[PDB]
Symmetry: C3
Subunit: 225 residues, 3 copies
């Protein structure tokens, strides 16, 4: 009767429980033992973006790209491969311009010209965003109150952390990610697969990721000979 249905539902819930739990455990295991080859550090990127946050965010874009090319030659994409690509993830819609991406790091420009917001994602990667323009509202897990950050501030999305994020129209930021980068792809592409059906955007995303990987491989080969 009712007790039988309660017990059966409890059994199925425990099934889903152990499935999700072992998925989380595997994510932790793959992430912790992942490689950690670091060309950049988040403080360098944050300071460089903060210095230029008072300028027009596109002038700041240019200046930051030029500085990153000067300080890390061989690790930033040429002008021919820079492209603004929409990003639909976790219920929000923004756009990115990828500057660098390896197995363990990535650097990009990110933002939005529309009001948007949603789930931040939960992956084995430390993400950091320095606002050039607009406002970034972060609502952390386990709290009932949120915080709003402004140009020049840096929000650090910690490893394993999950938040709600919200950006206002005209919000632009410099983003640096460090960790097990491929484990973020499932989050970054899911709304494209199950919501937007925008396969050309998927094409653009994997194209720029592959080009960044090929640049890193080419620079590694040159550094070894």
């Amino acid at each position: 009767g009712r007790s039988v249905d309660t017990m059966a539902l409890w059994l199925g819930l425990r099934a889903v429980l152990v499935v999700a739990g072992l998925a989380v455990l595997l994510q932790l295991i793959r992430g912790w033992l992942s490689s950690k080859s670091y060309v950049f550090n988040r403080e360098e990127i944050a300071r460089l973006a903060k210095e230029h946050s008072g300028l027009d965010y596109e002038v700041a874009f240019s200046k930051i790209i030029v500085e990153l090319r000067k300080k890390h030659p061989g690790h930033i994409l040429q002008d021919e491969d820079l492209q603004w690509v929409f990003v639909n993830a976790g219920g929000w819609m923004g756009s990115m311009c990828l500057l660098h991406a390896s197995l363990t790091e990535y650097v990009l420009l990110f933002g939005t010209a529309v009001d948007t917001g949603g789930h931040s994602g939960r992956y084995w990667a430390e993400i950091s965003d320095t606002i050039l323009s607009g406002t970034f509202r972060q609502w952390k897990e386990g709290t009932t109150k949120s915080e709003i950050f402004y140009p020049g501030d840096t929000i650090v999305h910690e490893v394993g952390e999950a938040t709600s994020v919200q950006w206002s129209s005209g919000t632009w930021m410099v983003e640096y990610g460090r960790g097990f980068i491929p484990s973020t792809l499932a989050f970054a592409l899911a709304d494209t697969i199950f919501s937007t059906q925008d396969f050309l955007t998927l094409f653009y995303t994997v194209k720029v990721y592959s080009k960044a990987l090929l640049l890193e491989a080419s620079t590694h080969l040159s550094q070894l000979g």
Copy 2:
């Protein structure tokens, strides 16, 4: 030619039509003949939340939990099992603290620290939300105009009804559901499966549901001996 393609599309549309129609019919059949064991009633919960809506919503949270424990001993989770868990569903993102959940009822605290909104869901369950803080905008099906509710009001999401819901930053409410509760899970988890990929949140959700079910089973066993 063109007529052939029109006819083929019409055939496939009629296929999808009868599939969805029989799905709706099965939802109605499972829901109507579902059990209706009721520990609470929506008027009791609404009045208790309305009385305290003028206080800070966290003080109200505490007072409502204490009253519910006093009036329904054995049917509310202990302090050790209370937890704020994100909820991503129907395009919106909020967070919940589950107080009670059986096969036929549930009681929780719900709200959001970000501006959000989306589809309410359509399930065989009567849902009711009493606002402690913020604003709740409801847009009913078949109308071109929406309504905004304020602290102390109660919105009743009727059985089989579908609306668009929208909450402003800092909106918090007491929610009571009555009907065939498991038929809501597919709606409550879908954005987690196909959008956020946040498997630890899924873990938390099934964990608290299972604990609430086990509490109900334990109290039933004690009441029978």
Copy 3:
């Protein structure tokens, strides 16, 4: 080691790349060689909606429907088949009333009573929306700035184009689509399948599409005898 993982990821990315690329190529091939039987034209619909944008959007709805019935008898649904149906797509939620739909064209009323926004979709179809009330913000691909349109304006979503769209509460518009209409269905239903689980709305959507197709077939049969 690290180079092996980089190479394997590059291989898998190239796999996803060629899959998405050939999907886009097939979309282009199916769209270009698709039929182009045109009962309406977008300038006619835009001018008719612009003329009435200064009136209450429901009075405008009625006047536009009456004019479209007068000028295109046999191609607009009778009063008995008009229905407001929710539309959840690309992360946004609005509602539509379908007036006309064939293999190559469609005419509908669209809008929203909630603040919403998301991905526009990318399909082989030229879409055009004339605002009767509210505001329509369009953010085009490849740009960091967006534009806001007002009552009486027409936004043209070009074939193959992808934008972010955003509508404010109380925004209502007349929409005309021309191209390969079925290729939009996957976008229009995806959030229903993977997010809202609202199968009765899916039922309503395929029902009105099938009725519009049957009306077009019946008028074609009458015109041929």
